[PDB]
Amino acid sequence: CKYSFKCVNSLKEDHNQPLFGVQFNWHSKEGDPLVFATVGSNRVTLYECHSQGEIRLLQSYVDADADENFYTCAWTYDSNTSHPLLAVAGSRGIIRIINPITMQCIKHYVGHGNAINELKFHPRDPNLLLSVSKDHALRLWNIQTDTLVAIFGGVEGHRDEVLSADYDLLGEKIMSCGMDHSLKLWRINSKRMMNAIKESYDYPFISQKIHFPDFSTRDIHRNYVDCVRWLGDLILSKSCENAIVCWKPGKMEDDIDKIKPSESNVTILGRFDYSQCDIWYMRFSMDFWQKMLALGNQVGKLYVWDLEVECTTLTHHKCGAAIRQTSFSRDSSILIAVCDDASIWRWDRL
């Protein structure tokens, strides 16, 4: 693999609880310092990367609920003020919108009847936040008008906890996955969904109840699916078989936008193999340009693959705890890994 990295720094957060999420803020402009957020226990912490491997603590948000366990975070910006914003959620099933400048909660949303496993902002509209939950549903929120745009679930929705979801590059569709072993497609560029999004801006507000997905498959994995990401028109997803599967709906030649909801075929194109990563709740990530794929394992190894090849293994002798998530900086110069023992590892690209 042509990609090489050097471990330049590490630290441990003093709460000693597992860190389940890490995200660089890809909205920061060129010239501004690289910043990332970590989430775990009832805390959200921000750090700035500086020269000579420096990981500078900025500040932390501690939830008033000592029993809250944050599982995910996502960055966005306020379209009216250009200020950054950070959304966080976890076991309480409450979405908190944090102002990262003050590290204070500015507003919150309730509605999910259980824990939230993932949050994702739409790539084109910074106000559209997607949440996925243990209640078997996905929810799309408009954080400018404080409205629940849509609930994806019901008759043909997920039948068990939803663990992951991702928008495609242009924000026309979502793929979700979970404990029912299924991967489901939800088109948000449908005339129904585009109009519902427009109505949420005009705005109690009546949410769309989307009971039926635009595609569904249980034929990629034979167990829970805990992470899914688009790779162009293709999909990457993982279960507990020490492999990330690259696949697509329909037959080899089928166009993603011509797939009918009743499509019964799937095409498996290949697998990215690894080892010692068969426990649940382990996420893989890609850089902005989708040239690198990264995944940590249960014994602290960090795998990196070059996606422009039709594997580099990053190890440090003191990094031995499970790596729950990783994040690349927008320019791919830094890769951060966070672990079960509250440790953070900084790897700089050579």
């Binding site: 803020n25 890809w26 909205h27 920061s28 402009k29 501004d32 310092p33 910043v35 921000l46 700035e48 900025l58 910006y77 003020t81 250009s82 200020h83 950054p84 990262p100 400048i101 790539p123 084109r124 590059l169 242009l170 790779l231 162009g232 028109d233 293709l234 080899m252 194109l269 902005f288 340009w289 989708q290 422009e308 039709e310």
Partner: peptide, 29 residues
Amino acid sequence: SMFSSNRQKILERTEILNQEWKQRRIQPV
């Protein structure tokens, strides 16, 4: 090729997002 065509879609779409990002001036944290 399946790989070459999908890479081209990724390249075109990431360039669209990168141009949208270049036009923005989000305040630093």
